[PDB]
Amino acid sequence: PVKLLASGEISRAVTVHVDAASAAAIKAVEAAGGRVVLPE
RNA sequence: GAAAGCGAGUCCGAAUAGGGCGGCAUUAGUACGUCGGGCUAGACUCGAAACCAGGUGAGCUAAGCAUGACCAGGUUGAAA
């Protein structure tokens, strides 16, 4: 499974479909506008 | 990090001393070839005494069984 981690920020509206993501990575994808999609 | 897991952070711990990690000023890997060296094979070549398996031998010799052969000549003089 896939994982999104907070490494390189530049800010952009993006929608990510990772199996799980780190607190900070969500608070960076949304913080620049966007969504982090995870299943049930 | 023992691991759940968490993640440029993570583990001890009830928070603050520290381990390993990223940033580090940071350079990058991968496929193949020739070469050094490693490991695993008999592993640089030649040599044991010995250990185990299967089988060959009693035409030698050690014995047993069966059936044959053999012992000039002389001395002594037991029982009955």
Cβ atoms of residues A13 and A33 within 8 Å = yes
- Minimum-distance nucleotide, CA of A6 to C1': B8
Straight-line distance from the first to the last Cα atom of chain A, in angstroms, rounded to the nearest whole number:
15
3-state secondary structure chain A: CCEECCCCCCCCCEEECCCEECHHHHHHHCCCCEEECCCC
Distance in angstroms, CA of A2 to C1' of B13? 31
Experimental technique of record: X-ray
Residues 6+ apart with CB under 8 A from A1: A19, A20
Q: What is the CA radius of gyration of chain A?
A: 9
- Minimum-distance nucleotide, CA of A4 to C1': B7
CB neighbours of residue A24 within 10 Å: 14
Nucleotides of B under 7 A from a protein CB: 6-9
